[PDB]
Amino acid sequence: MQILLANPRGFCAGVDRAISIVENALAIYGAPIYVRHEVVHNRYVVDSLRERGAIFIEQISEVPDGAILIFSAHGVSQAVRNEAKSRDLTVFDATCPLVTKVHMEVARASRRGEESILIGHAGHPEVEGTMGQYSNPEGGMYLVESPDDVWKLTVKNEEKLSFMTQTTLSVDDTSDVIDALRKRFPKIVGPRKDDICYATTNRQEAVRALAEQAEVVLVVGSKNSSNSNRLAELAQRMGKRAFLIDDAKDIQEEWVKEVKCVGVTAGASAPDILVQNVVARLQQLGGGEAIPLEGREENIVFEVPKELR
Amino acid sequence: MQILLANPRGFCAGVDRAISIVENALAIYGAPIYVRHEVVHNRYVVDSLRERGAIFIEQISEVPDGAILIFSAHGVSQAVRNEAKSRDLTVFDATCPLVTKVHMEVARASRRGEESILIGHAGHPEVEGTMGQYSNPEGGMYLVESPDDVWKLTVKNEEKLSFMTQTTLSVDDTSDVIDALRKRFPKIVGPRKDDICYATTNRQEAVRALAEQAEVVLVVGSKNSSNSNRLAELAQRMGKRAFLIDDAKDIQEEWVKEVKCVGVTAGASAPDILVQNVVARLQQLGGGEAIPLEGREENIVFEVPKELR
Ligand code: F3S
């Protein structure tokens, strides 16, 4: 059984920075260090940080004065940001720069009183944070998830409208939504394409190439990871059997029994160590040496704040 | 006399990467190493590298077969790139990712036979490289440097038009040019704002703050450094005497004689040691301890290609 590895895969620049922010805060100031929401959507990472003394909370009000607080890589609303600022707390923002970029544009539109449309999935923390950047009553901030939502959307002034997107969406599906947006609102303004980050675009591209060769595709990632779900979804839609798994232990023998080529990849929040064990498990199940596919090189890095190096 | 230091200033991610690419190539392959155009626009860096075995050329026909060639941070045209590919040469690309991003958009428009307009300064290597990404006779690639250029430009089909910009332009002036573009071509499409990179935006914002306090501003950077010139220009427009200098030796006493507050900054391609020597000279001229102004903390880093680690 041939084992193929997608490339690129795993850690993106934002996740690497976010994790290091928590680790370094712990190393430099010791436990406890409070984090609002899972720093990244990966069970393994969250469990490890918790075992090292990190305390994940849901509301800032749960954090004691004088403590250290970290915002997750997914970003937060202005209300959350302002609340933390007024509190007697030391705050370290692990929001990925690529999300902050979108935030700024939403705040800009809110400032001008012009309506904005966000393409994203309801309930996701990034969507919560991004829409949480808009607060001008005269304008408006709407969420659409599909062409259907666009078809049924109504706004105040279609002449002054702009759109933004979540960073981890399906490249293919988002294209459909944007097409509907421009057909419905010809004067809508946005970026040259969308706000899907380089990591999401690259990983979907890599899984596309993987799926072309593999019968089965294993995606290392947690259930609450948007980008990870998109990778498994892409493989499945290409006609291959795909499984989202947190670790090698989730692998069932029947999944790969008699399979000649199995592909493995990882969402932006899954550590390489997890992939290594997946490979090891597949090997004790008949797999040979893992073969890395050729892929787009990524060279972006986001440094942790100077105070935490 | 008080000495203030702008923040941020100096090295950007693209310059640091480009220099490292040349240094690593020299270490790995030894001298000589050819580089198309000054790797970055800084005399100090270029002189040193040249002494280390790097040979800077403008045309590929200047490079011998079997040699190693590296494209500068500013980027190159598709014509130059293909001429390099056809020739017997080992090629490495130090083009800054933020320039490549613009290239890809120009290439897209070219393939579609749709016209594009570049906002930039004629003759600059980046402009030649970016415009050199367009090669479709049906469409068009036009360069505009000011609103006046816009007011006199005519295109084949303004219904299918887009724009791009040089990465090192004056933020203020570019705004004026874009305002003109949209007024003359209401259907023109572009990025949300422009293609001016984070480093240029940040250094201009930083010099703006510096100039509000300093009577005289010294900008460390070479004469051919586009972004460096923009920094001195901004200060001058604010009514402050500003000088673009390569090193401490260029400082004339009359410039700071009897001046109570002198500010110092540096273009994106100027090494920090140059700034340190400038401060040393100002202290000899009566200046006290250098005081860094508070500023936007930059965290972007671009890694060198794996083949040059
Ligand atoms: S927006 Fe940021 S943290 Fe990762 S998947 Fe994309 S880089």
Ligand code: F3S
């Ligand atoms: S485009 Fe690239 S090399 Fe420096 S000034 Fe801007 S980052």
